[PDB]
Amino acid sequence: TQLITVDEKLDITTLTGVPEEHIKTRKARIFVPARNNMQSGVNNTKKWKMEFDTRERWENPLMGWASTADPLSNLVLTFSTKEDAIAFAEKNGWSYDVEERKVPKPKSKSYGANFSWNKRTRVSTK
Amino acid sequence: TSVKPIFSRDMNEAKRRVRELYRAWYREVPNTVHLFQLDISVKQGRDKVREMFKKNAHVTDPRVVDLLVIKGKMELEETINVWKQRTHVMRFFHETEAPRPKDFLSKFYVGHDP
Amino acid sequence: GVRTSPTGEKVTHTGQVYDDEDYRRVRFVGRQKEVNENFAIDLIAEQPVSQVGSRVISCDGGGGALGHPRVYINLDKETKTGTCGYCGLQFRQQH
Amino acid sequence: TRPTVRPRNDVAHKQLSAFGEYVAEILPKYVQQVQVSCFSELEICIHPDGVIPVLTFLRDHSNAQFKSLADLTAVDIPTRQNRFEIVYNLLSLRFNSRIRVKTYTDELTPVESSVSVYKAANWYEREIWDMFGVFFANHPDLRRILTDYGFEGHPFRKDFPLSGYVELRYDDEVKRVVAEPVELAQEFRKFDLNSPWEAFPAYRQPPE
Amino acid sequence: LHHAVIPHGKGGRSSVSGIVATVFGATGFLGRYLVNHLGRMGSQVIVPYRCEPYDTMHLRPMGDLGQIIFMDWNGRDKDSIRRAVEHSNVVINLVGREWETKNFDFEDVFVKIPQAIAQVSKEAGVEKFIHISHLNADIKSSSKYLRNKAVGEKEVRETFPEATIIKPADIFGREDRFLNYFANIRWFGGVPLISLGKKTVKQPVYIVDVTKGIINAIKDPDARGKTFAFVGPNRYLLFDLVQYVFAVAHRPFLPYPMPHFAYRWIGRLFEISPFEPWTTRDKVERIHTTDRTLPHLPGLEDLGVQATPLELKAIEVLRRHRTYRWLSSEIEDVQPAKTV
Amino acid sequence: LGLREIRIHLCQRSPGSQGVRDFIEKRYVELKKANPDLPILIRECSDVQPKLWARYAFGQEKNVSLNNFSADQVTRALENVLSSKA
Amino acid sequence: ILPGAAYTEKSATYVNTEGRAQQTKVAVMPPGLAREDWKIIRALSEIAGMTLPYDTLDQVRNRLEEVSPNLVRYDDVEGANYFQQASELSKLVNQQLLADPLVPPQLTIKDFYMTDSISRASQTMAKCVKAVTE
Numbered sequence A: 001t002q003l004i005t006v007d008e009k010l011d012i013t014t015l016t017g018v019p020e021e022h023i024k025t026r027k028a029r030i031f032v033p034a035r036n037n038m039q040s041g042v043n044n045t046k047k048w049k050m051e052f053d054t055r056e057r058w059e060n061p062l063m064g065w066a067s068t069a070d071p072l073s074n075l076v077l078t079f080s081t082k083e084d085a086i087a088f089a090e091k092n093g094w095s096y097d098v099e100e101r102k103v104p105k106p107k108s109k110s111y112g113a114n115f116s117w118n119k120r121t122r123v124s125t126k
Numbered sequence B: 001t002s003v004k005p006i007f008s009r010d011m012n013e014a015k016r017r018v019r020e021l022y023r024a025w026y027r028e029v030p031n032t033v034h035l036f037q038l039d040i041s042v043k044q045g046r047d048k049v050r051e052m053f054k055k056n057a058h059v060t061d062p063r064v065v066d067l068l069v070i071k072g073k074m075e076l077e078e079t080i081n082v083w084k085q086r087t088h089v090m091r092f093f094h095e096t097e098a099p100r101p102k103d104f105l106s107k108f109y110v111g112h113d114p
Numbered sequence C: 001g002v003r004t005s006p007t008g009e010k011v012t013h014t015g016q017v018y019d020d021e022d023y024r025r026v027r028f029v030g031r032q033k034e035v036n037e038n039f040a041i042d043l044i045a046e047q048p049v050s051q052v053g054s055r056v057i058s059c060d061g062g063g064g065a066l067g068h069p070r071v072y073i074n075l076d077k078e079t080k081t082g083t084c085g086y087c088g089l090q091f092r093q094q095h
Numbered sequence D: 001t002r003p004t005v006r007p008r009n010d011v012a013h014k015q016l017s018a019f020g021e022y023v024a025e026i027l028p029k030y031v032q033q034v035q036v037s038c039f040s041e042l043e044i045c046i047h048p049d050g051v052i053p054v055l056t057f058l059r060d061h062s063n064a065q066f067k068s069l070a071d072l073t074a075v076d077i078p079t080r081q082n083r084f085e086i087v088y089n090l091l092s093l094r095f096n097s098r099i100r101v102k103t104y105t106d107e108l109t110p111v112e113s114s115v116s117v118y119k120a121a122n123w124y125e126r127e128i129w130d131m132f133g134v135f136f137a138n139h140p141d142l143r144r145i146l147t148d149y150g151f152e153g154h155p156f157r158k159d160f161p162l163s164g165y166v167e168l169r170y171d172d173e174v175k176r177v178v179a180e181p182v183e184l185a186q187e188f189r190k191f192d193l194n195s196p197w198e199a200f201p202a203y204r205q206p207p208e
Numbered sequence E: 001l002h003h004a005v006i007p008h009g010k011g012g013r014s015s016v017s018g019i020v021a022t023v024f025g026a027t028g029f030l031g032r033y034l035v036n037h038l039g040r041m042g043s044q045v046i047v048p049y050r051c052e053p054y055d056t057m058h059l060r061p062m063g064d065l066g067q068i069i070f071m072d073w074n075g076r077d078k079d080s081i082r083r084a085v086e087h088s089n090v091v092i093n094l095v096g097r098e099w100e101t102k103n104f105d106f107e108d109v110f111v112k113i114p115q116a117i118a119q120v121s122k123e124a125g126v127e128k129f130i131h132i133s134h135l136n137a138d139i140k141s142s143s144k145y146l147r148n149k150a151v152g153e154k155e156v157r158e159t160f161p162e163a164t165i166i167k168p169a170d171i172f173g174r175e176d177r178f179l180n181y182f183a184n185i186r187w188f189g190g191v192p193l194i195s196l197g198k199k200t201v202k203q204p205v206y207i208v209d210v211t212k213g214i215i216n217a218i219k220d221p222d223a224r225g226k227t228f229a230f231v232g233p234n235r236y237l238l239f240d241l242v243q244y245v246f247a248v249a250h251r252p253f254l255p256y257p258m259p260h261f262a263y264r265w266i267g268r269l270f271e272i273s274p275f276e277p278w279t280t281r282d283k284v285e286r287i288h289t290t291d292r293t294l295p296h297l298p299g300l301e302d303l304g305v306q307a308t309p310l311e312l313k314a315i316e317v318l319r320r321h322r323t324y325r326w327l328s329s330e331i332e333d334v335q336p337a338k339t340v
Numbered sequence F: 001l002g003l004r005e006i007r008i009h010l011c012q013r014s015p016g017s018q019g020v021r022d023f024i025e026k027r028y029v030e031l032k033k034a035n036p037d038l039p040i041l042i043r044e045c046s047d048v049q050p051k052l053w054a055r056y057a058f059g060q061e062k063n064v065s066l067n068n069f070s071a072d073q074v075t076r077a078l079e080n081v082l083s084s085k086a
Numbered sequence G: 001i002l003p004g005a006a007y008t009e010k011s012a013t014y015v016n017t018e019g020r021a022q023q024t025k026v027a028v029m030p031p032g033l034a035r036e037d038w039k040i041i042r043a044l045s046e047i048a049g050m051t052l053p054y055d056t057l058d059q060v061r062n063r064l065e066e067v068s069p070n071l072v073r074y075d076d077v078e079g080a081n082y083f084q085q086a087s088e089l090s091k092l093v094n095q096q097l098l099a100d101p102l103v104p105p106q107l108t109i110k111d112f113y114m115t116d117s118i119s120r121a122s123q124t125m126a127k128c129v130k131a132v133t134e
């Protein structure tokens, strides 16, 4: 036979070694990262990402540094599709919220529209 | 839904392996209190073994509980052989940590964590 | 030109000084608050404004490769001197 | 392209292509993909049931003789449904050659241990248990090798954070080295360094 | 409430607990575990030390960087106390001696120094001042220790109105002089007592419970002006207590009574050298002094601290004295001492 | 002590809210004139089951499932809410 | 005074003028002892003895769904029909139009940069007002 049939849910929360507080009380976020509007390049809007909620950063009294207690504060995971991220978050027991992929709609670009006859879209200078 | 097992074909053999592991830990605990010369009683160590087994009493997947039995026997191999020390055994007793606020009101009083 | 707070504590060139009720002065109890008494904003005020007859002046801070990258400064504003963004040496066109 | 660009070895590329065809058609039961990179290295991407029949082949076939197990490796890629990727780097001292044998697993599927082929793997896949949680069935002494004895979790998985979950300190009350939950005096600062411009058009993927 | 002392973090090591503590006498037995429990919350702990700085080395891993500030002081110097307590929001005093010396007798250590510390903490605006007296403090007491400590308690109260005064009965731990006093009299001849030590009744208290009570009194605003009496959960006689001490240590026990006729003279027999005296006549008068029961004063359970008995920690204290032939033994070996 | 507000959840495209829509096109206006200072919050959503939340005094909220009902059944349930006043 | 949280400083559902409910994400934490707003209100209910049936933010949003389910359905404009019935309810009582002409409170660029408690406490907005009054 050399196979079994597991009808139950794929769940590995007892195996990862993560404490319970960083399983149930966190909120994973599954999102295509938004385009840095400083830059027209769109290679940062390709792959899905999973972050978590940002917990407390406080002042270190010695140096003024950003001390923190959240271990998962720097954990940003990369997933090629959305449902892989959803299956990964269901697999680890993380409660997740999903933003959809915001794509720009195609615009009607016309260079002659800058020099129309009766339309308002004449440019005032070039 | 056809996956490959580890040791157990279903939940009954898996519970058999959990039960043999519990038998082995229950035999091991008096020697663990003795040779490590811990400062707890034997009954307190058996209570901690009971708590660590009841922590994972919710899983209905045979591969996950097979891996839990494998990891528990690795813990037992590191316990029978003196590979762990007094510190690694007493890490199961979260003693130096303060008890965390459990109710909403004291968590509201001390911090931002829900 | 370091100035001293009313609590008796020196003030850095940033302006950082602990308040009177702040407990974090206790790290200086029996010890010293190390500040540098050569303020950069006061040592750059002492530099003379360089008169040139050009319209655009190039500055690398002196030393060639031992200074900063060579940048070009416009001096069309007869009101305001052209301060270098790296070294702070300010230039004025003499016309 | 003479001074800076690396000189391409086309002879080794053709020879590894021919040997990859050779291995792909001798073992069609397990071999999924065969690929040769630009710098002429061969990968035989196989099925995880074929750990023993491939590696015993390459160790014992007279045209392969991959006698030395150089490096056994796991790679965590969480976007795949079999996230862990087991890599066998093999050296044939007879034919002066190097091959790579790659396969897959998830957290729960046991990979067949290769100590009956290469005893060199006796620690390596043990490390793959210690770092990745990949279980290896019929291993002689499978346990942790690199982490602390009471350490909970598998560190080199990518869902495991850089700093752990517990840290140590000596405690004078209990006169003992204890583990508290980890707190940093300074947070590990994350540098978002990905340039938003496509660096390599040759590795462009087709869109959805 | 200044912004730098606002409590942050999860209460771990590198957090900000909002407590700035000047712990006088932190180099001793109680101050060790007090700085241990304060620095694991992330408290600014000022340690004024009198001794060699090497004897403060064990205080350095007890907290995060910049959370312990070591500084010199003199007992007869109000300038050093003003230099120390001026930034703190709590001052805990722990200066004590089991014996009187050439330079410091009991009137200096218990009456003069805590009154000076509390006066300087008052005129520098310190919010909380905690004093550690002894449960058997009595003006009419037969021992100089308890008389001077009751006088100093009265003076700490009358110069600091919100002083939290704490009465431990008999503190035991790894570095105590209560169970280690009992366990290190074996080769002297058979543990001498008055009337076989069965006319005095004690209830010892454990040092982690004392420390939890002190720190939960730091964090309680309702402990201002109160007077606490930290006692154990069970009251023993002295004889069955020494029975239980030598029975946990797995030692032979051959007692004999020792009356007034020469057991006050073993004091002047055993401080003949200028070292630490192994026993003194004040320690004689205090071992054979029963612990009073004060129901009106609050205790550990009125601060939410569970009093841990001796049958859980006596093995931890007294495993050091077992030779080798009963080192590897169990806690289920000794039948416990009878309560009263 | 009495009814304080009514909430009516429904949908635009679901047939299960259909008679509930037939309650609002025909029988809401003379409802609102009969209850001048009773807030009756009509909430249209994407795929919810229809619902009748009746909040009473001291935060007591009672729940009626208006799924797949006709206009007369929704009218009878709402007038039983108006008549009961728990 | 109960010190609350700000929009960068809490996870929080705001609904724009078109009905599209949208959640903010926690960027930083509130300064000092200041806590999140509904945390404060829920703890006040726990003090007074009128404890509300929610403990976590998801339970607040389940209550918020019970009030209206178009508050927890994010980036979604739920189309609101029944203009005719609101019109027929509008024609009941004739309130009369005043002869004061319609003047907005924000006539020029002077009146834009200081509207709420955050903008009036801003030195950038203060420089903007000082630089548009000249």
Ligand SMILES: NC(=O)C1=CN([C@@H]2O[C@H](COP(=O)(O)OP(=O)(O)OC[C@H]3O[C@@H](n4cnc5c(N)ncnc54)[C@H](OP(=O)(O)O)[C@@H]3O)[C@@H](O)[C@H]2O)C=CC1
Binding pocket: E024, E025, E026, E027, E028, E029, E030, E031, E049, E050, E051, E075, E093, E094, E095, E096, E097, E098, E104, E109, E132, E133, E134, E135, E168, E169, E170, E171, E177, E178
């Ligand atoms: N069984 C007990 O321990 C009990 C103790 N107490 C009280 O609790 C307090 C702490 O007890 P404990 O730690 O065990 O005693 P210790 O003698 O071990 O500790 C006393 C501390 O105060 C310092 N100190 C002592 N004498 C002087 C002095 N003359 N001038 C300046 N500093 C001095 C010591 O430092 P240094 O090395 O410089 O001397 C040390 O840090 C004391 O006030 C004691 O009376 C009350 C009830 C029971």
Ligand SMILES: [Zn+2]
Binding pocket: C059, C060, C061, C068, C084, C085, C086, C087, C088, C089
């Ligand atoms: Zn320059």
